[PDB]
């Protein structure tokens, strides 16, 4: 589990599985050194409305 990943139990439709949440920087942080811009997140993995 290199940092930014961790196991998380999930009650799938049948049985359960140790789903690995995965997290990583996806586009370089340095849009500006002075920039106040937020790190807007982009969830993926068939996001539901909930």
């Amino acid at each position: 589990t290199p940092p930014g990943v961790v196991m998380g139990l999930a009650w799938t439709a049948m049985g359960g599985s140790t789903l690995f949440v995965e997290t990583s920087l996806r586009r370089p942080q340095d849009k500006d050194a002075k920039g106040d811009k937020d790190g807007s997140l982009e969830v993926t993995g068939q996001l539901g409305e909930v």
Binding site: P28, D30, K31
Partner: protein, 50 residues
Amino acid sequence: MKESARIAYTFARAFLMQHAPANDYLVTSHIHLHVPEGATPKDGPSAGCT
């Protein structure tokens, strides 16, 4: 593709300063770019190396 766009702009700046320091184009030169449309956006990251 905007994420890939700044990723390519950034990595291209980095690779050029890594290899040919005397040149200063991507670090300081405005650049219009165009990529032909047609591919589905989900596969569009594949074009980023190009």
